């Protein structure tokens, strides 16, 4: 036997398509483990999930377990350097993150496959001896504060906390989990708390092996992975901590039959209906709540949504079970509201209860369960191979809930038909345990309560006994019918043999005036799926703000019109994306190849013969107006949006679109559509389980459907225009300044434009960014604590590129600027001082990043798709660019920096976007020139040259 191992699990049930090998085990100290051996993987990975989270925070230090999560990255006894962990990952093509929920704290990384042990050794120390360094603590409290700051004016986060504030205040559910400077520093200081000791005590009390689950994925054998995990994780102490449990629901009697009227930040209009329920987690083999969610949340003919939409009351609906914690759950039915729907909330809810009564009247349906089961089994068998980092993180969470042997299957395979459970949950969905919340600007000034953590304005009322009784008497409405058999359920899963003329990259198999067809039969994944991507080119989609508006409305009305039909396909693993672009339209159809030609045909047919329902036009127009207005409530880092506007030849602002929108009439839209479709060019990628002849057939079916119904003719080659990037002058510095009216933080984007994309320019820029990537985070966030959001990397647009920095902060942008410049000098010196081997590690790390193989079809499709829509068509880019990268020296990167990037660089091309807050041993910052302040974007663009477009490969 082995004393360090309590038990090795039996065979871990997996898909027969899954070539990864698995071993489950439990260590002597109680840690549940899953080992995943993948000898092909480019990146290895591990995750650990501790079954403790913010619900276990001390009542007097809100945010403590989340603060602890940040602090674990900042040094341990074995590895005391504050950024040892993150630096090691960066230098070895790795990445890491962590999250805290109510009951879990989950930590994960990936890394180059040959450096798993080194990454895992550093990771393991988090759970053994963190330093909680006193200086680290005082700095990092600002990252958490800034994290909360960004959430404060976010409508979703405000509602999340409001639900908690309106249940039983004595229940742990009411806790504020994020924490901030006040809860984590200021108040603790006022009350004599040694926060470092509190962190040490919480870690000591709760970071117990018996509450932990670890997952490791690597190229190593299952035996080698076993020895690794035993080696590193056997020393975690078992303190036999009881798993927290919350059997009493936070919503008791006095919290039920309540109405909440809420003022949002954005101009949004929503209704939230919720019912307290028992914890259904244990019923995973039958899943009664999913069955009810499927039915109540259905969007097909006869559904709840269909009738509410027909009445003109709501546009979208989400229904089903929602997690609480061990011991409690919620069942929800949430809808957005039209203006008319806001006046008919009572009637909307009556319809909800009529639908529920129909479920009660028909009884549980085994055939519905069977579909659900069948679909889940197909989904499991043919699941796309996951990226290691997300996969390990997900399994570590669910190891706490299922037997070892079932961790892969448990969330998919359904086994038991349980009409007793379906009825039991259905018996909870009654007017006497309903909570109702309306979110609307119309409640502005009419509220009398304030939620303390976010400031949310609301009013709480008892629902009148007469309203309840009316809902209790809901009878059958003839508009409500159960769904019928889902005919999109796929049955043909045959993988076509690999054709003799098959190619490693997409081949251009059709090149006509009307269409350009790129094709690749899948030679890697061998799942019965395909991706069909189409760009429709028409200059008429973006000619002016009006036409851009009409393009948008057209496609939104089309999706709205197809919804009832497309929903069945979606349940059956067949989806589509349809959107307007600056060049025309984009269509993507993905999923099981079987029924895929049928959905595609329907989309093009509907496109080309579209007739608009006037009521839907008016509703969707009003939603779009609000959507344009609501951009005002987006986050300051806005900065990105202004830079895009500034740097692109043609771009309509949100303001211009807003103005043009009133001029969108039904007559005008009806005229626009045939004009849009009259002349087109189509560029397509058809990629997956499909032959050349099926691909050619699909392409021509799309053309013929347009030709037939819309009389489409080809666009002139010259009309296939692409937009250029503005060309900044040597040594120029421009600043554009605006104010964010909603958020009380600044945002900045700094762009150092370099030159057109090419092999050499690409790799100079990418190597530099690789070298500065971790240091920028470490310097600008960890040390200087300028904000939660600190980003650096290549910016690529319209065939041009450069280096960008994005920061969101309480500090003014002019200050942010001087800190980024101080940082840039630090990096020049750091590049001078680094060893030739440190330099080569960064080359190798970038190389691994660029060569990492797609694990699934759509990831491979997206790479080819990027080559196609950018018109570079460089399908072998990675090998070619990496071969050149390996050639680079320190002097090359120094010369590049000195020529293009240094403050005194002869070819420095700098543009800054400064977004001001609503209310508006540090290294030496260099002196900066006076910027030219941009007053008018049009004038700015007029006064500068435009770059060329990049030549196709």
């Amino acid at each position: 036997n082995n004393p360090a191992i309590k038990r090795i699990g039996n065979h871990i049930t997996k898909s027969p398509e899954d070539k990864r090998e698995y071993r489950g085990l439990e260590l002597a100290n109680g840690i549940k483990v899953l080992l995943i051996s993948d000898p092909t993987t480019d990146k290895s990975s591990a995750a650990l999930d501790v079954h403790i989270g913010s619900l276990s925070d001390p009542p007097n230090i809100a945010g403590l377990s989340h603060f602890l999560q940040h602090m674990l990255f900042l040094g341990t006894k074995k590895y005391p350097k504050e950024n040892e962990y993150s630096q090691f990952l960066s230098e070895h093509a790795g990445s890491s993150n962590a999250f805290t929920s109510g009951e879990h704290t989950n930590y994960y990384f990936d890394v180059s496959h040959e450096h798993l042990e080194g990454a895992l050794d550093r990771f393991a120390q988090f759970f053994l001896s963190p330093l909680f360094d006193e200086s680290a603590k005082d700095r990092e409290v600002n990252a958490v504060d800034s994290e909360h700051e960004k959430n404060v004016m976010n409508d979703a986060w405000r509602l999340f906390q409001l639900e908690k504030a309106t249940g039983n205040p004595k229940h742990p559910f009411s806790k504020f989990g994020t924490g901030n400077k006040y809860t984590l520093e200021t108040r603790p200081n006022q009350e004599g708390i040694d926060v470092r000791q509190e962190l040490l005590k919480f870690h000591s009390a709760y970071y117990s092996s018996n509450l932990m689950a670890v997952v490791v994925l690597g190229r190593e054998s299952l035996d080698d992975l076993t020895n690794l995990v035993v080696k590193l994780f056997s020393e975690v102490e078992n303190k036999n901590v009881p798993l927290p449990e919350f059997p009493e629901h936070p919503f008791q009697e006095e919290h039920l039959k309540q109405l909440y009227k809420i003022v949002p930040i954005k101009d949004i209009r929503n209704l939230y209906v919720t019912f307290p329920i028992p914890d259904l987690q244990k019923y995973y083999k039958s899943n009664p709540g999913h069955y009810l969610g499927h039915l109540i949340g259905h969007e097909g003919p006869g559904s709840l949504l269909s009738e509410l939409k027909s009445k003109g009351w709501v546009n979208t609906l989400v229904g089903g079970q929602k997690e609480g914690a061990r011991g409690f759950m919620f069942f929800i039915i949430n809808v957005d509201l039209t203006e008319e729907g806001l006046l008919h909330v009572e009637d909307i809810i009556l319809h909800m209860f009529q639908y529920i009564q129909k479920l009660r009247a028909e009884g549980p349906q085994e055939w519905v369960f069977q579909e659900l089961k069948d679909l889940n089994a197909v989904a499991f068998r043919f699941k796309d191979k996951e990226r290691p980092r997300g996969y390990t993180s997900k399994i570590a969470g669910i190891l706490h809930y299922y037997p070892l042997e079932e961790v892969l299957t448990a969330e998919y395979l359904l086994e038991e038909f349980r009409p007793d459970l379906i009825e039991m949950v259905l018996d909870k969905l009654r007017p006497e345990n309903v909570r109702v919340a309306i979110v609307s600007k119309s409640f502005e000034g009419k509220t009398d309560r304030t939620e303390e953590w976010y400031g949310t304005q609301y009013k709480q009322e008892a629902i009148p006994d007469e309203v309840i009784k009316k809902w209790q008497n809901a009878d059958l409405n003839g508009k409500f019918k159960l769904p019928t058999k889902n005919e999109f359920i796929p049955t043909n899963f045959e993988i076509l043999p690999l054709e003799k003329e098959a190619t490693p990259y997409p081949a251009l198999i059709k090149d006509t005036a009307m269409s350009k067809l790129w094709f690749k039969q899948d030679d890697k994944f061998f799942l019965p799926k395909a991706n069909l991507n189409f760009e429709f080119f028409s200059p008429f989609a973006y000619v002016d703000p009006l036409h851009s508006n009409m393009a948008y409305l057209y496609l939104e009305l089309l999706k709205d019109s197809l919804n009832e039909y497309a929903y069945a396909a979606e349940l059956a693993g067949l989806s589509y994306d349809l959107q307007n672009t600056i060049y025309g339209m984009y269509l993507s159809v993905k999923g099981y190849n079987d029924k895929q030609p049928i959905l595609l045909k329907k989309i093009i047919e509907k496109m080309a013969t579209f007739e608009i329902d006037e009521k839907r036009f008016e509703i969707i127009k009003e939603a779009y107006m609000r959507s344009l207005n609501n951009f005002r409530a987006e986050q300051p880092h806005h900065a990105m949006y202004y830079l895009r506007l500034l740097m692109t030849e043609v771009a309509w602002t949100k303001d211009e679109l807003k103005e043009a929108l009133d001029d969108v009439t039904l007559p005008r839209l009806k005229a626009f559509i045939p004009q849009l479709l009259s002349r087109l060019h189509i560029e397509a990628l058809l990629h997956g389980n499909i032959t050349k002849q099926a691909a050619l057939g699909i392409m021509q079916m799309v053309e013929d459907t347009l030709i037939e119904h819309a009389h489409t003719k080809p666009l002139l080659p010259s009309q296939l225009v692409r937009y250029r990037e503005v060309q900044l002058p040597d040594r120029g510095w421009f600043v554009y300044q605006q104010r964010n009216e909603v958020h009380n933080n600044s945002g900045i984007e700094i762009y150092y434009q370099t030159d057109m994309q090419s092999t050499s320019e690409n790799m100079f820029l990418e190597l530099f960014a690789q070298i500065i990537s971790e240091p920028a985070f470490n310097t600008l966030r960890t040390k200087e604590q300028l904000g939660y959001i600190v980003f650096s990397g290549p910016r690529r647009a319209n065939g041009i590129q450069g280096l960008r920095f994005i920061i969101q902060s309480e500090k003014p942008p002019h200050y942010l600027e001087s800190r980024v410049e101080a940082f840039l000098i630090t990096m020049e010196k750091s590049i001078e001082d680094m060893t030739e081997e440190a330099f080569q590690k960064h080359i190798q790390a970038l190389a691994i990043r660029r060569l990492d193989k797609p694990k699934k079809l759509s990831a491979e499709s997206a790479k080819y798709y990027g080559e196609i829509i950018s018109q570079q068509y460089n399908f072998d880019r990675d090998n070619t660019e990496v071969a050149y990268l390996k050639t680079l020296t320190k002097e090359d990167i120094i010369k590049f920096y000195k020529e293009m990037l240094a403050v005194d660089a002869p070819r420095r091309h700098k543009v800054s976007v400064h977004v001001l807050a609503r209310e508006m041993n540090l290294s030496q910052a260099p002196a900066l020139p006076q910027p030219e302040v941009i007053q008018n974007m049009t004038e700015f663009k007029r006064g500068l040259p435009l770059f060329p477009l990049v030549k196709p490969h």
Binding site: H70, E147, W157, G297, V318, G320, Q321
Partner: peptide, 9 residues
């Protein structure tokens, strides 16, 4: 249709 956590480092 059928069916908030704190990051980062």
């Amino acid at each position: 249709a059928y069916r908030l956590v704190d990051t980062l480092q």
